[PDB]
Design a protein around this ligand. Structure first.
Ligand SMILES: CCCCCCCCCCCCCCCCCC(=O)OC[C@H](COP(=O)([O-])OCC(O)COP(=O)([O-])OC[C@@H](COC(=O)CCCCCCCCCCCCCCCCC)OC(=O)CCCCCCCCCCCCCCCCC)OC(=O)CCCCCCCCCCCCCCCCC
Ligand SMILES: CCCCCCCCCCCCCC(=O)SCCNC(=O)CCNC(=O)[C@@H](O)C(C)(C)COP(=O)(O)O
Ligand code: SF4
Ligand code: SF4
Ligand SMILES: [Zn+2]
Lengths: 96, 208, 52, 95, 176, 126, 114, 113, 52, 43
């Protein structure tokens, strides 16, 4: 940031870019190293009523795997999912 | 059960169940079990004589097209007489799906190599040789891949200790790195952590 | 939340080192794009699951 | 509150000091035996007993969430103070 | 939702062909690369003057370990062995007994700093803020066993760095 | 045919890479672990475990740590039945001993027995 | 008791494979002594090969000796193709390891191991 | 319209995709006639191959054929037809419509143990 | 890349091995002013990609 | 509550596309300058 405008002009000419608008060295635009103290929020289970753990127990809703076939007519041939939709070319910048 | 519980995907569960029935009835010669997990992952548990015919099916069939071998895995489970559980994770890019193909072997029965189906397996089952001692028949260049060159023992077997049986040091008498029996200056401290209370009643096994 | 961010996937044509170079440079571009979308769409709330 | 063995070695706040015929003093030859000379047992004795007007007192160590978990101390014994099991501060009912 | 890197057909009119031939014979992109290297030549470098200038750290920084005290001199560690239970590398070795005033205190608090992975699971497992991982990163030794800290060394690191450790905890305890 | 008939005992000791000192001088113990009597839960008494005889632990001269030379000092194996553990130890050439599973015998409980008319089983307080 | 074989249908094919592996190691020992520039003789290296073959000489299972021949071929390929260094070849000669007490009385004198 | 490239490296553009797909689908059906009728591979593969062959015979366009065969480019539809043909030729030799060759041991797929 | 390691260190305390993304969420919330500096990084990083 | 959040209108736009800023003369013009330098040198 302390470069003279002659060196700054030579530098912007050699790079071809306005380098002072986007400097890679950091200055007073960055955050303070001392911040105010946060007040972090609580989640949805911080409630005093209607908050039984059995109604939100994720680990105890996991089941053993359903055995579809075990060795102890004109039905449709299936796939593991529908076929994948063809991706669309970018409207942003397709390079086309 | 909205915020903290994982949302269940019923559509994928029904579709993978239908495709598991599909594979179980196209290939009843080798398919032993078919299961779908609660988080919607299909497992085809097969006989080890059908490693090539099942994997060639899923790779080449027009309703499967599992063209990618994501991962090939063994698991040592010493309580089974076929202690090694060979796991083939497969990816169909056409149907955007994943399947798991599982089989078994013990220490002495060879599994047929799947390099003719997926070339990706060339190192993976090679690693299953190095880490578990599962021999793979008709592998092109089957040898060790991760251990040291004079390494005795298959380390990811669960009877193999955490520190090994040997440790290296440089010895200035012989001017050479040497191998000696392992002595730890501090033993690894085994922690018995398991609670004496049942955690998941849905997984309760029937008693004797 | 990758179904909620908007970005592009760079695709090669010749299968070589150079198109893979260009794919990685363009993935840095698209990562900058996703970072902008994440900084604007950052929601309030907790950061651990509220299952203790 | 450090003392010294007859070997010339500082006894730690645990009470550890090597014997005279112990060869492991040779590790301190030309070097030093690092001890901490602020014994916590000698510093928690220097605190005054808090005279409170209640029967059950609560201690968190001070600082709120920067202390220990908040425990409750009963003060029914007039023979002996009620000591916090974490920070070692002790309390006496003022009656 | 995808784009094609490198699927351009170059124009075959005489203007563009002569542009590509002036590039080939007159080395135009090579002068472009020399220009960008010349452009960094006249920039101020990013080089800080270590050891007089220091890299910027945050108050969360995980450096050297320290056993802390209360504001009475009593050590915070009440020998609960949670830090060595959570310790992913098993670097922490703890032995305890009741001492002369009956208090639950350690007789051994060792940290092997050459097993330690500096992940700070001990300071977040600790219920009384006894073990912390302080701000010192410049503690390189000349001998391996100088990095095998016992309780005396860790309590001395606490007494050494406490004026800084307390302020870092004061900055970051509302995120914890 | 493509199946051979091997009537020999299953022995993989030449293939495991375990040195001879830790095959023929080790005693494997096959057991269901006892319930920790600090606690009433029984979920740690559901499986068979295999462990080995504890070897020498000594004091590290530098730090006082527990130095060991036994590689098998932490090797605890889990088995669904007793026969799986026996077969795994026989396959590996380990000399083993088996302790049978100790179940608690079914007790006879009655809350009314706390207040009998004429038996010694009255509770003096409740 | 009907198991799938690895290479050998019986023990005679297995002994044929053991024998060919021993021939290949016996031919390889002088080249191994030379190009790894070892301090042992060719006779001492062939003694170590014979010791390692006699170590497994009690096996009666065809599949186990098939895996032993496979692992010997792997070690031989690691020796011919110079993938081992000198240290991996010299690990068969436990030279820096002090000799262990063998009788009862010296094992009693040194410690607790049976 | 003569598509310039398929976009996939090493997957060459087919000049006549319709005739190649008709040849490959009738060849799949001819190979597939040598499988027993009750085999599920035969029933399912005849079903999907007749569906794809009727879609090919119903659409003269190449682009619309790609968007209703729904298997990507037309050349990788040809590649999948070749893969299905090779698969069915292997399924004749393997005979996987047979019963199960061997039951597993009793606790082979029991998790947890 | 040094500045993005500073982002890691501001959010976790380590420059590389953060142990920050955990099963259940992340370990700790973003410190104040971190998103401003991530914006200040991203605003200039396209010029770095352009000169590469 | 006080939490690390974006500002009210969000952050500003961030450039993420390629900018190779197309500098230099034409090929005709560069060969003209080179041939003119040769002609001056030859004269
Ligand atoms: C070309 C030949 C060199 C001419 C001097 C020169 O270009 O100085 C750099 C000077 C400043 O360039 P800059 O990179 O923008 O400097 C910004 C600094 O923040 C401005 O500099 P600063 O803020 O860091 O000021 C302190 C600096 C001041 O810097 C100087 O005094 C520059 C060196 C002068 C010699 O002094 C020092 O750091 C002491 C350095 C002493 C040794 C310098 C080298 C001596 C070489 C011969 C022996 O360049 C110009 O003013 C433009 C070019 C002038 C060329 C004149 C025609 C020929
Ligand atoms: C320089 C150092 C290099 C060291 C070389 C290490 C080579 C390690 C390869 C190990 C391969 C084996 O030991 S497989 C041998 C196991 N064979 C058996 O169990 C079958 C019994 N075999 C025998 O008795 C063999 O002596 C014979 C020659 C096949 C038959 O002899 P019997 O008749 O009397
Ligand atoms: S920082 Fe991690 S590895 Fe180091 S002592 Fe603490 S818990 Fe153990
Ligand atoms: S340092 Fe903390 S976690 Fe570790 S034993 Fe002491 S009080 Fe417990
Ligand atoms: Zn207290």
């Amino acid at each position: 940031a302390s470069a003279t405008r002659l060196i700054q002009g030579l530098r912007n000419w050699a790079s071809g870019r306005d380098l002072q608008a986007k400097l890679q060295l950091r200055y007073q635009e960055i955050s303070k190293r001392t911040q105010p103290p946060p007040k972090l929020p609580v989640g949805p289970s911080h409630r005093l009523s209607n908050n039984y753990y059995c109604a939100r127990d994720g680990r105890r809703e996991a089941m053993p795997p359903s055995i579809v076939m075990s060795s102890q007519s004109e039905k449709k041939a299936v796939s593991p999912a529908p076929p994948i939709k063809r991706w669309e070319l970018s409207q942003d910048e397709p390079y086309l | 059960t909205r915020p903290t519980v994982r949302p269940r995907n019923d559509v994928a569960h029904k579709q993978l169940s239908a495709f598991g029935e599909y594979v179980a009835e196209i290939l009843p010669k080798y398919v032993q079990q078919v299961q779908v997990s609660c988080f919607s992952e299909l497992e085809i548990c097969i006989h080890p004589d059908g490693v090539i015919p099942v994997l060639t099916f899923l790779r080449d069939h027009s309703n499967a097209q599992f063209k990618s071998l994501a991962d090939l895995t063994a698991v040592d489970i010493p309580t089974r007489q076929n202690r090694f559980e060979i796991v083939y994770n497969l990816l169909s890019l056409r149907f955007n799906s994943r399947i798991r193909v599982k089989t078994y072997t013990d220490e002495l029965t060879p599994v047929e190599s799947s390099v003719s189906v997926y070339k990706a397996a060339n190192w993976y089952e090679r690693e299953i040789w190095d880490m578990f001692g599962v021999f793979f028949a008709n592998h092109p260049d089957l040898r060790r891949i991760l251990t040291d060159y004079g390494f005795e023992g298959h380390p990811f077997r669960k009877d193999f200790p955490l520190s090994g049986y040997v440790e290296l040091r440089y010895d200035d008498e012989v001017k050479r790195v040497v191998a000696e029996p392992v002595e730890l200056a501090q033993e690894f401290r085994k922690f018995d952590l398991n609670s004496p209370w049942e955690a998941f009643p849905a997984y309760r096994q029937p008693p004797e | 939340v990758y179904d909620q961010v908007e970005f592009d996937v760079p695709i090669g044509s010749r299968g070589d080192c150079y198109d893979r170079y260009l794919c990685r440079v363009e993935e840095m571009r698209q990562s900058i794009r996703i970072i902008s979308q994440c900084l604007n769409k950052m929601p309030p709330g907790e950061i651990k699951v509220d299952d203790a | 509150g450090v003392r010294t063995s007859p070997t010339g070695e500082k006894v730690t706040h645990t009470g550890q000091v090597y014997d005279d015929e112990d060869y492991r003093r040779v590790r301190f030859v030309g070097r030093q035996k690092e001890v901490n000379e602020n014994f916590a047992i000698d510093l928690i004795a220097e605190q005054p007993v808090s005279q409170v007007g209640s029967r059950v007192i609560s201690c968190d160590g001070g600082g709120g969430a920067l202390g220990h978990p908040r425990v409750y101390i009963n003060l029914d014994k007039e023979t002996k103070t009620g000591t916090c099991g974490y920070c070692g501060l002790q309390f006496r009912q003022q009656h | 939702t995808y784009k094609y890197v490198n699927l351009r057909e170059p124009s075959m009119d005489m203007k563009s062909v002569t542009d590509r031939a002036a590039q080939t014979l007159l080395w135009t992109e090579l002068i472009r690369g020399l220009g960008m290297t010349l452009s960094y030549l006249f920039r101020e470098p990013a080089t800080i003057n270590y050891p007089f200038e220091k890299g910027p750290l945050s108050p969360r920084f995980r450096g050297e370990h320290a056993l802390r005290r209360y504001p009475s001199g009593e050590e915070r560690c009440i020998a609960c062995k949670l830090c060595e239970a959570v310790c992913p590398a098993q670097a922490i070795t703890i032995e305890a007994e009741p001492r002369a005033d009956g208090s639950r205190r350690t007789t051994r608090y060792d940290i092997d700093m050459t097993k330690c992975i500096y992940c700070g699971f001990c300071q977040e497992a600790c219920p009384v803020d006894a073990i912390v991982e302080g701000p010192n990163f410049e503690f390189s030794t000349e001998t391996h066993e100088e990095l095998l800290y016992n309780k005396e060394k860790l309590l001395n690191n606490g007494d050494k760095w406490e004026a800084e450790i307390a302020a870092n905890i004061q900055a970051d305890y509302l995120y914890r | 045919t493509q199946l051979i008939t091997v009537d020999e005992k299953l022995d993989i000791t030449t293939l495991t890479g375990v040195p001879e000192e830790h095959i023929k001088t080790r005693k494997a113990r096959i057991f269901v672990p006892a319930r920790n009597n600090m606690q009433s839960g029984v979920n740690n008494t559901k499986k068979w475990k295999m462990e080995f005889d504890t070897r020498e632990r000594w004091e590290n001269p530098l730090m006082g740590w527990a130095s060991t030379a036994d590689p098998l000092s932490n090797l605890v194996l889990t088995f669904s039945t007793k026969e799986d553990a026996i077969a795994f130890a026989e396959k590996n050439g380990w000399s083993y001993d088996v302790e049978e599973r100790k179940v608690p015998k079914p007790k006879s409980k009655s809350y009314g027995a706390n207040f009998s008319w004429n038996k010694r089983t009255r509770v003096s307080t409740k | 008791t009907s198991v799938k074989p690895i290479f050998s249908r019986d023990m005679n094919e297995a002994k044929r494979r053991v024998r060919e592996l021993y021939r290949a190691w016996y031919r390889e020992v002088p080249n191994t002594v030379h190009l790894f520039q070892l301090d042992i003789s060719v006779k001492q290296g062939r003694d170590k090969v014979r010791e390692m073959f006699k170590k497994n000489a009690h096996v009666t299972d065809p599949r186990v000796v098939d895996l032993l021949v496979i692992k010997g071929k792997m070690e031989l390929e690691e020796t011919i193709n110079v993938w081992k260094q000198r240290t991996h070849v010299m690990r068969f000669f436990h030279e820096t390891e002090a000799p262990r007490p063998k009788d009862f009385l010296s094992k009693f004198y040194v410690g607790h191991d049976p | 319209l003569l598509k310039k490239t398929t976009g996939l490296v090493g997957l060459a553009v087919c000049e006549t995709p319709h005739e190649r797909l008709k040849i490959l689908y009738t060849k799949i059906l001819d190979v597939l006639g040598h499988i027993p009728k009750n085999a599920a591979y035969r029933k399912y593969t005849e079903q999907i191959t007749n569906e794809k062959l009727s879609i090919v015979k119903a659409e003269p366009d190449v682009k619309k054929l790609e968007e209703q065969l729904q298997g990507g480019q037309i050349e990788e539809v040809i590649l999948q037809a070749e893969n299905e043909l090779s698969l069915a030729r292997k399924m004749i030799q393997w005979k996987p419509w047979e019963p199960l060759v061997e039951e597993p041991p009793a606790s082979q797929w029991k998790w947890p143990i | 890349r040094e500045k993005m390691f500073e982002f890691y260190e501001r959010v976790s305390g380590a420059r590389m091995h953060a142990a920050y993304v955990r099963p259940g969420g992340v370990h700790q919330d973003l410190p104040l002013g971190l998103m401003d500096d991530i914006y200040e990084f991203s605003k200039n990083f396209s010029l770095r990609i352009d000169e590469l | 509550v006080k939490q690390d959040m974006p500002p009210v209108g969000g952050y500003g736009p961030i450039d993420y596309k390629r900018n190779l800023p197309r500098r230099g003369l034409s090929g005709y013009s560069m060969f003209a300058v080179g041939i003119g330098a040769l002609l001056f040198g030859y004269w």
